[PDB]
Amino acid sequence: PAADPEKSYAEGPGLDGGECFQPSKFKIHAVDPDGVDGGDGFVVTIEGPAPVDPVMVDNGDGTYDVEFEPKEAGDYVINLTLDGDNVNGFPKTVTVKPAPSAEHSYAEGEGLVKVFDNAPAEFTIFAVDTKGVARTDGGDPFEVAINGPDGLVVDAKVTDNNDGTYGVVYDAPVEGNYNVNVTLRGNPIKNMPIDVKCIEGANGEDSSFGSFTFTVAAKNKKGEVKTYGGDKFEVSITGPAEEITLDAIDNQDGTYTAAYSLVGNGRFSTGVKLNGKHIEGSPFKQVLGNPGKKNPEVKSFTTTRTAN
Amino acid sequence: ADPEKSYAEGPGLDGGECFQPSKFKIHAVDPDGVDGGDGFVVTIEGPAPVDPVMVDNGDGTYDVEFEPKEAGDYVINLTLDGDNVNGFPKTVTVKPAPSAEHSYAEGEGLVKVFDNAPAEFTIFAVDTKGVARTDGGDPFEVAINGPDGLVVDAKVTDNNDGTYGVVYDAPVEGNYNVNVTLRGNPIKNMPIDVKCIEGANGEDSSFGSFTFTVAAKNKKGEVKTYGGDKFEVSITGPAEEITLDAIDNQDGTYTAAYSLVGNGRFSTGVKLNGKHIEGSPFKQVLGNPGKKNPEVKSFTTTRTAN
The missing domain is CATH 2.60.40.10 (Immunoglobulins)
Structure with a gap:
């Protein structure tokens, strides 16, 4: 019970892909039709974008262990013959991949x-x-x-x-x-x-929005920016506010400032007067929170602060 | 002369003051005339006693003065030989005298x-x-x-x-x-x-500048005590002029200071790490939309911290 070329396969990791410095192993399983223990007709050759002398460490039972390690390239042909006949695997072609680099990545x-x-x-x-x-x-x-x-x-x-x-x-x-x-x-x-x-x-x-500040630049009868204060400065905020704190400040230099921390759900309207007249675009409207989840037992008051 | 056809006239027989002279003039007639005789007599009755000085006349006129000393209502008699003249007695109200040391x-x-x-x-x-x-x-x-x-x-x-x-x-x-x-x-x-x-x-x-400052909070529901967070501020609208600044006060507070000049409706997006805050965006309204430049197409000015 000498060999069969045909009913005797070969298999293994490494007749399936490759890598640049890594060993590529596979195993021959000799059959006659069935079975096997160490006859020696098989021979492997590997051509590719390099040379590659493959070791056929061989036998015991009717199995053979072959390994070769490709030295960096893509496609390699592998021919497995049995007494000069094509085993029922081959010729067969693997594609070796390059190798990743420890300090090139x-x-x-x-x-x-x-x-x-x-x-x-x-x-x-x-x-x-x-x-x-x-x-x-x-x-x-x-x-x-x-x-x-x-x-x-x-x-x-x-x-x-x-x-x-x-x-x-x-x-x-x-x-x-x-x-x-x-x-x-x-x-x-x-x-x-x-x-x-x-x-x-x-x-x-x-x-959360904390505090807000807006500054007005007071204009005189000439149409120029005043350079001192002294005017009556009133800031009126109107809305629903679980909390408020407002400030009407005369920065004594031509400008007046309002500083306020306001918190609530709805839409808001702030009136701003300089000597009992609204400034260009007063009041101004805005919206913070949401008029929905807003409380019922809330009033809609009007806070006022004035400057000397 | 005669009681009925002769008549008096003058300021002071029309109203009075205190410590001002009341002056009126008598015209003796017969019918129509006068030159001196005498026959005329005056007395004032009032809240206070008064003594009218009568200055008898050249031609058939008389001059009587009497200044009222204390005040309200005074009665002015005017007999001729014991015979009320054709406007008497008369009633005059002396009002109090304004004072320059008390007004x-x-x-x-x-x-x-x-x-x-x-x-x-x-x-x-x-x-x-x-x-x-x-x-x-x-x-x-x-x-x-x-x-x-x-x-x-x-x-x-x-x-x-x-x-x-x-x-x-x-x-x-x-x-x-x-x-x-x-x-x-x-x-x-x-x-x-x-x-x-x-x-x-x-x-x-009008308005120059604007500021608002958010208190950043972490996951444990507390407030932070330093910065580090990407804080982003974006303003959208028909801005005719504008400057913006996103500031990390490097104490877990962030501030936006901006100056806007524009004519329309505005909204502002505030992101503490790619996620809107407890109101972002808040919409304000400035400048009348109808008067603005016919071409100012609203845009977005963005400024980031970190």
């Missing part, structure tokens, strides 16, 4: 710059190959360890963007320092690791 | 005046007894001098109650000597120096 994003404690930090890893070019696709094993305040671990989420890019996300609940180490093949890649600062983070949507 | 003036036009508005005060006539005059017909006068020895005419009105309203124009800044008089004597606290100042013209004035 970097990361950018606001995630390695400056992080708030109430919004997710982002950034991208950039995959370069051995030579210099940038990786087309993915399947490269990059890793991301995050160690923040109080040493504690932070679980980053790496997303294979199928190009030679991977997206990174993480949450930094506490203000503190965060060490972000991004290794390739367990080797800290471009300028990795690196500290990152996270600070307390304003929360827009729940954030 | 006084008040109004903001004695305090502080603007060069762009009429100044006003009131006179309060007080009588010689220190009782507020009741009614008018008092000859109070007003002399105002302005700053280059200019002359301001004041317009005095007679409130028909013992007071008199006054208005004047102090058209230039400087000082204004206000002097109110009564038959030549300055009333109490006169004259007075009044400072007039340059007046603001409200209807022609």
